[PDB]
Amino acid sequence: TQPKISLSLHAADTTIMHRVGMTGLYMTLKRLEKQYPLSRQRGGHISWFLTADTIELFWEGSDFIALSWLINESFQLDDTGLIHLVGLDNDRIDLRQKIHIHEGICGVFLRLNKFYQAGEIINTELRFEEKQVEYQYKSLTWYAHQTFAEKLCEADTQQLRHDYIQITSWLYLGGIVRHARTQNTTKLEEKPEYALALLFVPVVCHYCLLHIPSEDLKERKPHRYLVVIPEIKDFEDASQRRWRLQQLETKQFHVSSLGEAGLLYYSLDDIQPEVAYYQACQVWLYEKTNKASRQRTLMSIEEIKIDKNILITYQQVQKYFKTNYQIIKYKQIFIKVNPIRSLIADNLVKGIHWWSNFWEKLVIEDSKEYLFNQLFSNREGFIIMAENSEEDKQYLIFIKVFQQAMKGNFAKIYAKTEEGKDPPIKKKVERLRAELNYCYDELSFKEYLSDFLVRGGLNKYFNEHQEEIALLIKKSPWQEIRIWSLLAIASYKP
Amino acid sequence: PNYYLYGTVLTRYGLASLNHDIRRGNKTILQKGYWNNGKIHSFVGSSAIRWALRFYLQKQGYLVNRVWDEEEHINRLTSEDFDPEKFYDDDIFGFALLPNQRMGALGMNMAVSLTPYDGAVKLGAKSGREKDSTSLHFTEYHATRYQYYFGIDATHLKDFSRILPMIDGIMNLPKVGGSSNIFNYPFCPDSLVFQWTNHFASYISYCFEYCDPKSKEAKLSQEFIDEVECGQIDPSKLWIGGTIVKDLQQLDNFESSPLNKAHIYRNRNEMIEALKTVIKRDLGL
Amino acid sequence: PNYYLYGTVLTRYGLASLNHDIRRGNKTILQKGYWNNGKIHSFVGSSAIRWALRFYLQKQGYLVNRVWDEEEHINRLTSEDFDPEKFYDDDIFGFALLPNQRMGALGMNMAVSLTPYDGAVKLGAKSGREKDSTSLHFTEYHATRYQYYFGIDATHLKDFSRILPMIDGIMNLPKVGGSSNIFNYPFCPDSLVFQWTNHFASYISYCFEYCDPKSKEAKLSQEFIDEVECGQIDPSKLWIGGTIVKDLQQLDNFESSPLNKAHIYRNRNEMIEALKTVIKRDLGL
Amino acid sequence: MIAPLILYLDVPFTTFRESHAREMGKTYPVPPPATVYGMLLSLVGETNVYRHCGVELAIAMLSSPKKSRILRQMRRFKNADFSHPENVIPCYQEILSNLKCLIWVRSDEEKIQPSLRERIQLAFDHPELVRRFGCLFLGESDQLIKTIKLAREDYLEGVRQWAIRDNRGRLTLPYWVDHVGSRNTRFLRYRIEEMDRLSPPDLAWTMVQSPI
């Protein structure tokens, strides 16, 4: 029959949020026909025709009852008070991820209590490794999503309105009224179908928790919420992607950068070498302005465009570099994110070399060795990427030169070592690190480096690349040469 | 009217380690950054000199809301409510407790090192054969003259007479926070460039330059002298005193340059007395 | 007959942490963004400089509707019905309301640090034996020169005589909102590029450019000189003044270049007097 | 058919915030047709907005700019008292730096003489004759324009990034802006395609009309 509601991704007036709401409509109707294949079931005898990029609606009788049934079935609340969105497959989602998504949605969409009424704070002690950490969350009772149907349809005729409808920030993120004194007039307006899309946006977007590297996670529980909103190219592709991303563990969702969350949203995407892969998504950062802030405010929006090379490099980093340490304490499941992974990811998104300044972060900045230990755990990975770096070549040759020189020095010590006595190779290595760290200017450090190279003996590598290594020593700032010498000492493996 | 006092001050030559930043490993790095010509210079923070001025005002006997217990090494508040009318430190340095806040008359900038920092370090070790993890250590030091810029608003002072003790404190600055045990660096001025004008525009900020990259010479910058030549920065409102007076007087054609008709005094106390007389005449004190 | 006055102004070299942005628990990040060649430069908001001009206008007579209560650190508004014919601030900066509105007769871009920003912060642990929170603060600072561009339609002014006080204010800019307590950074001009033309477009927006990281030479950008030599951006309407005049006069073939026949003065005040005379003659003051 | 007028644009800082981005100063990558149309009206000194409906505008983006965020204590009309702290709110606004673009103006669809192209041309031949107010700016009032000049298709003789109106594009630029609310705002979906042409492709022509 004729469409009372018509929605197409190809429509010009739509924005990204309208498209993601359209995808939410697509997936919730898919789950509904999975649950109610008999159209009759749909109170009001709704019938949806779904295509790759079009969602098509027909029903019987007055609209009000039809959209009321649709809304009531779409958004629900379980006994525990957590959110229940039929678009997402709650059956195979565990309770921890349900708490995660519910907390996110009340923290970003239902930020205001004028739209929702909460229940009692429900605390449950979930068991991990013989530790019953008490998850404490505020249960809900009602929210404006369940009853937007009254605003969508006309009061007198119980039918969809034929004019623009004023919307609010809970429907469209970022759509606050700047001037409260002009609340009646300066309010965002939209057509009813786009209003329904803005109703159903929350299902598609995932939610992640951000941890400030400067802030000790022990002294600061995470409260910043990152909302990942993906650009829509096809309904089925987005639905499959979201259902795949449902598999991930909550400890993955805790990230240290917006780009990390964006890459995680596309981590489970299939890679096809014949198909040119390209995916785009938006990351919306929500954070309390101050300590006593009542509700979160949108503090950053950043676009991520991921191609094939960036994604495979990110998978390589994930493989080589260690995962998060799920520290668990008194109801305190802290998550230790590796800063390096994020640093690389950031540089990747920037398109700049991953090795922008790892050492700076690993040692200079990381005196505590929080990620320096990760360096120790992932030093090979660092070298791997450095190997990829062609410019590193010269420094790699210098690494081999210094390793040969220290091999010669250790051979000299072995010759000096008396029979029966244990040679202090560990003590000599510690002395090497201390002496290199002692060097305070270019002249002294170059003195020590040249003297050590001479004491090493005949070096094959320094003979083969005489001019290149000589020019590298002459040109490079002595701090850099010291850094790579320390890396050579740390990377020595006979 | 609206009178303000601006000045750039140069210190004597000596070994200084006054602004250790967050140390790494065993070496206590003193804070440093880039400056003219791209060479790293050592910085002493302006908060240190503000603390020194606060301590001077406390010692001389003025009210001072914040009392610094030397033996306890703690800071106490005479009254929880800041009263800029009654307290000199609240009047000058301002406050913010979080009325509630004051802009603060004294506006001071960092203390840069006139000579670039080569990287000289000093080793210190605990005596005795019994050696532990805290046995030996390295402390970074710098042999330099330090230069900082400050600017105060005479009108903004709640009591206009408070400008005199601040000048006396600048000329008699107590110890600036550092390591006085092993690097006792006096921060007393030895060359001033003071401007006391009704316009705000200031062209005396960091007007000192080194003759040689590693030397204690401390000649006046070419830009400042050239700007005095060109026509701005009226010599009648200029006040230069200290060791740079000798170098200025040994310059060629000095009797013809506009620098001649500016207030220059070899003795710093005389120049300070003259400037204080001028200020007291201008502000009706 | 529309008349405009555009100008690119470069400040001195000093230590600045002016505008800042939202902190991260530790560190007070000076806001920054990309610029020429993609290098990150520290910015100063346009509203900051407009606030500085408003404060200048309020400080010296020149009736202001938007008075700034220094004691309360709040903005009180004298007459809710804005009257540009009387208040200088509504005449220049304009106003907004729910007659209805008035576009400001002044538009200035945000100030840009002439040199790219390098990691530069300042630790500030507060003195005291007790070491509680709200200590170890970090203040990201920058040792560069700031260059900002402004443009005024003198015709749009309700009172054509109000152009001159703005000239004095831009010359004697009191203070851009910043950490004057820690980093007293003067904002008075050191080199000016003014143009007083009836043309709407002036191709002199950002002519001071040196890059060459950690340096202060601040040469005139090559593109500006090429544009001058091309034939457009008429040198007769140009006004060049400041320290850049020295470098221009040391340029080879400058005596024959078209830039020679532009109004050029080493002395800033002579520049201002000549430009004000021209403006008054053209506007019939 | 008379060659369409071409303008060279160079703006140091600019921001074209999004209609629906009212909580954040997050901006479009490209100047929207509505903002360009308004700036052209300001250049020609045309206060009325309905005077020059029908003019077709095409934008060629010479270099992709960088996006940077800045903090501002923007003032809002929340409380009746002006001095109340509720008015001042700290929020972030994104800016675009070193924006260089070329604009094609085709005023043949205009039904009122003289057309916008003729007015812009006459303004550029005789700058003294044109009477207007204010200072020319793109986006926010304080974001002045470094250089707007008459230029040919060969001014950079380089490679151009055009804005093309694709039904499956990413950008949603408005060509008519309703400042009060969002009723009359009209959107078109665009994309940035890297093509080596000195003349705009048909699709790239965005023709401004009243929302009715």
Side-chain angles (χ1 to χ4, degrees), chain C residues 15-263:
Chain C
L15 285 168
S17 303
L18 311 193
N19 207 103
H20 293 145
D21 81 83
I22 289 160
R23 51 96 188 163
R24 332 292 310 287
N26 256 5
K27 279 151 83 62
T28 48
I29 305 184
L30 257 184
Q31 47 190 337
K32 44 205 166 55
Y34 300 92
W35 190 237
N36 303 12
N37 310 334
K39 324 276 168 214
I40 293 185
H41 291 248
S42 76
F43 298 155
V44 164
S46 53
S47 64
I49 315 154
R50 311 176 118 265
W51 192 101
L53 274 160
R54 263 203 181 92
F55 198 55
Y56 174 89
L57 286 183
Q58 142 177 17
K59 276 295 292 187
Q60 310 176 353
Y62 295 162
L63 296 174
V64 192
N65 193 14
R66 214 267 283 278
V67 66
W68 160 263
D69 196 329
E70 319 174 5
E71 281 72 21
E72 307 285 341
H73 281 77
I74 207 50
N75 284 294
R76 332 201 69 84
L77 204 145
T78 67
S79 163
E80 305 51 21
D81 301 1
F82 305 88
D83 180 20
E85 323 295 328
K86 193 223 282 192
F87 297 111
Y88 279 53
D89 65 343
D90 311 357
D91 194 349
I92 299 157
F93 311 92
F95 57 88
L97 273 167
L98 276 41
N100 196 337
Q101 83 222 20
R102 188 199 194 270
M103 153 149 300
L106 203 179
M108 31 175 67
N109 270 15
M110 61 215 58
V112 153
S113 53
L114 184 139
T115 326
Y117 174 73
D118 48 24
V121 82
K122 164 70 176 127
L123 176 58
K126 51 204 312 173
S127 293
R129 162 61 183 219
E130 93 289 11
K131 231 69 168 189
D132 84 79
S133 66
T134 80
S135 64
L136 300 171
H137 38 98
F138 291 78
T139 88
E140 286 200 8
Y141 67 107
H142 206 200
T144 57
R145 330 172 81 139
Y146 280 110
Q147 148 209 25
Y148 68 95
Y149 165 65
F150 78 98
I152 167 171
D153 178 12
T155 300
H156 198 349
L157 278 189
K158 289 306 169 58
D159 176 21
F160 284 76
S161 71
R162 301 212 168 106
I163 181 49
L164 266 42
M166 168 181 319
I167 285 305
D168 316 292
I170 287 188
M171 261 286 331
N172 301 354
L173 198 50
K175 190 211 89 167
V176 186
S179 311
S180 314
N181 53 323
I182 314 323
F183 307 105
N184 188 5
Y185 185 84
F187 228 69
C188 58
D190 200 3
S191 48
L192 282 83
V193 173
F194 279 175
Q195 146 156 308
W196 161 267
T197 173
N198 48 322
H199 207 296
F200 38 79
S202 65
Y203 325 116
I204 61 160
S205 185
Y206 284 106
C207 44
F208 298 99
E209 167 266 354
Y210 186 43
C211 185
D212 293 32
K214 333 156 198 61
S215 206
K216 323 159 28 174
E217 296 47 20
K219 89 192 177 312
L220 229 51
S221 71
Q222 203 46 54
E223 282 64 17
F224 168 77
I225 303 182
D226 304 309
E227 265 269 353
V228 163
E229 298 273 346
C230 273
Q232 44 271 49
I233 190 51
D234 188 25
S236 64
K237 314 285 196 55
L238 267 282
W239 302 72
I240 302 314
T243 176
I244 191 59
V245 182
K246 179 192 301 176
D247 283 8
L248 292 188
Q249 270 142 349
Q250 303 303 40
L251 284 180
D252 51 348
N253 324 297
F254 165 70
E255 312 296 331
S256 61
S257 167
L259 204 52
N260 194 12
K261 66 207 75 182
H263 299 59

Side-chain angles (χ1 to χ4, degrees), chain A residues 12-275:
Chain A
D13 49 338
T14 71
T15 78
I16 176 175
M17 185 93 95
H18 297 116
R19 260 92 49 79
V20 315
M22 214 86 67
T23 290
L25 230 45
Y26 177 79
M27 318 171 314
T28 175
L29 299 201
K30 280 301 181 199
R31 285 291 172 173
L32 278 181
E33 57 199 298
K34 293 156 195 176
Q35 169 49 50
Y36 311 103
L38 341 159
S39 169
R40 211 243 53 78
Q41 288 157 300
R42 290 101 87 148
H45 302 73
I46 278 164
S47 61
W48 50 85
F49 180 42
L50 309 181
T51 88
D53 41 39
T54 321
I55 177 177
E56 236 296 2
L57 251 69
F58 333 103
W59 49 113
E60 299 177 4
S62 184
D63 297 353
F64 188 71
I65 40 185
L67 299 59
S68 300
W69 151 265
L70 218 50
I71 286 185
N72 295 346
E73 281 286 347
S74 310
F75 328 121
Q76 284 164 2
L77 285 160
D78 38 39
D79 320 329
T80 62
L82 295 175
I83 208 49
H84 186 75
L85 299 169
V86 303
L88 297 191
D89 208 358
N90 289 32
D91 311 347
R92 52 171 291 280
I93 296 185
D94 55 83
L95 258 282
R96 285 194 59 262
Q97 319 267 33
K98 277 171 190 172
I99 288 169
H100 182 83
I101 166 175
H102 150 274
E103 281 181 339
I105 176 155
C106 35
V108 63
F109 276 69
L110 307 154
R111 108 192 72 188
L112 240 190
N113 70 311
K114 288 297 171 184
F115 301 114
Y116 84 104
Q117 298 161 0
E120 285 46 50
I121 301 179
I122 298 192
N123 309 347
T124 177
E125 301 214 6
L126 293 181
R127 144 51 190 80
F128 333 119
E129 314 84 33
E130 210 38 86
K131 307 153 193 174
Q132 284 207 355
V133 161
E134 193 185 31
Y135 261 80
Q136 317 208 5
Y137 63 82
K138 197 173 199 198
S139 70
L140 331 172
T141 57
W142 161 94
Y143 43 66
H145 276 85
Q146 272 143 334
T147 52
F148 195 28
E150 202 47 87
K151 297 294 139 274
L152 277 172
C153 324
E154 307 162 18
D156 53 341
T157 72
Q158 298 71 54
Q159 291 161 347
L160 83 175
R161 300 186 64 168
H162 298 94
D163 63 313
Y164 290 77
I165 308 95
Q166 301 195 346
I167 54 194
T168 320
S169 58
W170 68 281
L171 214 54
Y172 201 113
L173 308 169
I176 58 180
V177 183
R178 295 256 303 285
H179 314 290
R181 298 175 59 187
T182 67
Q183 73 301 354
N184 187 27
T185 68
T186 85
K187 214 152 181 177
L188 293 184
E189 308 179 357
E190 271 292 86
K191 306 177 188 176
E193 41 271 358
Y194 303 105
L196 191 75
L198 300 190
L199 254 191
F200 285 78
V201 47
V203 182
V204 181
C205 34
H206 198 66
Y207 322 86
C208 319
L209 280 181
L210 182 66
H211 303 243
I212 300 196
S214 80
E215 300 314 307
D216 158 45
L217 175 52
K218 204 52 201 63
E219 87 192 4
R220 172 177 248 90
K221 64 162 311 303
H223 87 277
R224 290 143 203 81
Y225 259 121
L226 298 174
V227 191
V228 280
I229 317 169
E231 205 286 335
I232 308 303
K233 308 188 174 190
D234 159 66
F235 285 154
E236 196 45 55
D237 170 44
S239 307
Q240 295 308 316
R241 179 173 291 104
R242 172 60 200 149
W243 288 325
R244 280 192 209 96
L245 271 310
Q246 287 199 176
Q247 308 143 11
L248 293 181
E249 158 67 340
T250 314
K251 96 151 199 172
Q252 316 193 37
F253 298 152
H254 296 232
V255 310
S256 37
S257 158
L258 302 88
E260 198 180 2
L263 273 277
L264 163 153
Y265 194 97
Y266 289 128
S267 68
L268 290 205
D269 293 27
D270 73 79
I271 276 287
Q272 285 306 123
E274 59 283 336
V275 184

